[PDB]
Design a protein around this ligand. Sequence first.
Ligand SMILES: CCCCCCCC/C=C\CCCCCCCC(=O)OC[C@H](COP(=O)(O)OCC[N+](C)(C)C)OC(=O)CCCCCCC/C=C\CCCCCCCC
Ligand SMILES: CCCCCCCC/C=C\CCCCCCCC(=O)OC[C@H](COP(=O)(O)OCC[N+](C)(C)C)OC(=O)CCCCCCC/C=C\CCCCCCCC
Lengths: 79, 555, 80, 79, 79
Amino acid sequence: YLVFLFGFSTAVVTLIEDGKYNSLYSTCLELFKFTIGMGDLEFTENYDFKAVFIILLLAYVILTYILLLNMLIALMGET
Amino acid sequence: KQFVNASYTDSYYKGQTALHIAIERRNMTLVTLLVENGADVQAAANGDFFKKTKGRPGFYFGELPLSLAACTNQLAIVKFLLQNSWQPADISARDSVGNTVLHALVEVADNTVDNTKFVTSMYNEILILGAKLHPTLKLEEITNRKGLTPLALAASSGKIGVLAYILQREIHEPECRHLSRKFTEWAYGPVHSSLYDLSCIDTCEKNSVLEVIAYSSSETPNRHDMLLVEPLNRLLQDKWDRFVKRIFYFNFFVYCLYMIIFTAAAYYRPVEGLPPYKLKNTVGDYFRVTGEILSVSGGVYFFFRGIQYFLQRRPSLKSLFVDSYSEILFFVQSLFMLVSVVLYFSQRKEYVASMVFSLAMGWTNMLYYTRGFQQMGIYAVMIEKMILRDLCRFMFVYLVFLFGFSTAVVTLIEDGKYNSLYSTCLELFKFTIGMGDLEFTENYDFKAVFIILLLAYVILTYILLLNMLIALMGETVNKIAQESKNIWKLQRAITILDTEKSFLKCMRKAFRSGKLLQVGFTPDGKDDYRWCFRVDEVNWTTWNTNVGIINEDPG
Amino acid sequence: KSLFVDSYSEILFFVQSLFMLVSVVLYFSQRKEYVASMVFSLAMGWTNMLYYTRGFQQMGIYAVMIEKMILRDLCRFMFV
Amino acid sequence: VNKIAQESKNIWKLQRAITILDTEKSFLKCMRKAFRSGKLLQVGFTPDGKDDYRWCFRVDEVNWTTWNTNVGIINEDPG
Amino acid sequence: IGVLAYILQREIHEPECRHLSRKFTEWAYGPVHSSLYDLSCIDTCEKNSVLEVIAYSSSETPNRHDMLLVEPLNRLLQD
Ligand SMILES: CCCCCCCC/C=C\CCCCCCCC(=O)OC[C@H](COP(=O)(O)OCC[N+](C)(C)C)OC(=O)CCCCCCC/C=C\CCCCCCCC
Ligand SMILES: CCCCCCCC/C=C\CCCCCCCC(=O)OC[C@H](COP(=O)(O)OCC[N+](C)(C)C)OC(=O)CCCCCCC/C=C\CCCCCCCC
């Protein structure tokens, strides 16, 4: 999960142009919020190519929230 | 002659002879009578009914009476044909496709207990008889039209039982024990040291067993299970622990450095407009240009390694998108990098989009190196299986439901911000991640219809489908432990073979074991060395047999 | 008794058609409630695509499992 | 989910059988090609000397144990 | 289900009474033999065929989901 979070957060922060969320820490926190049921999906607009932003966010959400956490529940059940 | 040798002329039964019919019916007396009157024992049944699979009906047995008798479990008839006083059968004869009796025996194997026992027993009997009659003949070294020996044919066809029998073959009969592939070097009390012949296992220059199994197509019946046969697992572990672990660790370190440099270079991209960007005179600018050069170099390297793979392995366009997922992923990342460079030098801003896609793919590609550690590798295999089955079914059904309910809701809405399909789709998707509003708009009539639609969608997706996905994931996880372990082992075998084929710089130390005498001498007085692999075993029951030991003064 | 314990797809398709026809009737009576009936019909029609999962083994068994979940677990949970 | 694998498979098979029967009963436009198998002699003749055809369905089987019984075979020159 | 399975695969090897059987052996070459299944009154009888009776049976029939597993029926439906 940490590998995936760092990769997608670096991609998103690279896409962002300027503003409050042009820092690695801020974007990392914004993306971690998705894990605890508080993700925004529209936390910033300082970019071009809104499609790239939404595609990145959706891919991260599908890979982590919908797959990894439920798989963790299943593996815990096995153990 | 011309009466006891008459044969069918129809293309379906072309080549059939009365000897074949007598052999099939399991009649020894009739076979002897026919052979006495000059029946030819080299008659070939070339009819279409005797082909392997072309046409649904048929039974392939090698087309020769000896092969027919062997494949039908008639030991007495086989022996009679081999050592008759009228016309002895040729043990080294090949059929149209070049398959001998052993090739046909491998072909008729189907991985069942009774069939496996029959085939292995008949193989052993034929080998012993051939050694007795012609001690100078190498039956197992004869290749067919495809250029495969019986061992290679068994390995490439998924005949796990025959492969297991061959690799651990032990013959304790003097004057014929040179045919064995497993030997006992010494035995002291309960512990004995065994030697496994590795000829044609890890290096044959045509097709070794390891290469054949590792690079087999996705349709091979038992590709993931064939590496569990005794010697192969230990051999692969030995190669790993001797050089491949260290080469793999170095590769992982280099990839980590490359990704760190790429991330740093992309983080500090200038924001001025319309690249290319002029080089300022500062240390930071020089570092940022160096990083961008290194990233492009890595992208080019991965692009060329993908091209080289696609050329060397030649995927059949079905193994392309059902096997080799990592090759495709790395190639696509390199493609994004190169497209980004091209856009950058055309004065386009879309190079940033391509670059961020490349960066995300590169960071997710680190999961490839989990292979090399058992627990993480099996975890990654399980992740792959989850994605391939459970997430794919769930996503299909969920997308259908989401689109249907979003179209209904947007149709109900009258005007405003949410009168677009994209906006309503996003609003309804927010419910999946725990952020649904339930009151995000009021631009409608019939509030009851709006709330009913939202509640129905919530119940159908959030409360049912996601929890059902968790349950199905639990079932799948429960059912795939051994399969995932075997797949991880095959992945590591492929890594080991690739490293061996393309060693780090120049050191070809990848040699199996010691060069030893294991049976002393062939039927001729000359002595033989075989390149054996040593395995130590401890046994307490059956305290002492110590037959056939090669060497005194153990140790 | 087989009407409401068997034949679920027949009833679902029939109810969707009923919503469509009621929508038409309301439309020609100068009523705005035709929109409500139409959106109900649209949602039912999109969810009815799950019928065609039969014809593929894995998706068909997945749909059967969904039906069983709805019939037992969701019904007890929803009551309580 | 753990307890209903076989039941779900059987229910899916019954659903597909119902679909097949419905399609047969009401074919697409006019082509009634929905005939089972070939028209063959299987026992030769009834107790009376007359011969009988039955509309049989062919299934091929491979068996290795009990190598050869070959009793009651209808037809020579197999294939 | 037991009676149905017995009837559909009935094989009588006694001469002068084997015309009563519903399963036959067309030919046998070595380990592979071809079997013929009588399909009379199975997929079309104009009164009530076995397939129609099972498919359109009421929900109270004891083994409606399991009766299609009897040997010939599954292969016939797949064909
Ligand atoms: C400049 C460069 C241009 C390139 C642009 C492309 C960039 C995108 C990045 C990568 C794309 C390439 C990588 C994909 C390779 C092919 C994968 C595939 O296609 O493999 C199909 C599988 C085949 O193997 P199999 O069937 O036997 O699997 C079971 C396996 N067994 C039974 C053997 C165990 O078949 C299946 O079923 C799986 C079918 C789908 C698999 C993918 C994931 C499905 C799961 C969830 C989808 C989530 C996103 C959906 C979209 C949502 C948006 C709102
Ligand atoms: C203009 C047109 C006008 C028409 C307007 C109507 C539109 C609405 C759309 C469709 C309605 C028709 C479709 C319903 C057909 C009857 C379904 C039913 O009724 O089947 C009752 C079942 C009987 O089969 P069974 O008992 O043997 O099931 C176990 C099965 N076995 C044991 C055999 C395996 O009996 C049960 O137990 C299940 C009892 C309830 C089943 C439904 C779902 C229950 C689960 C969750 C409810 C979630 C919503 C609750 C409301 C929340 C609002 C806040």
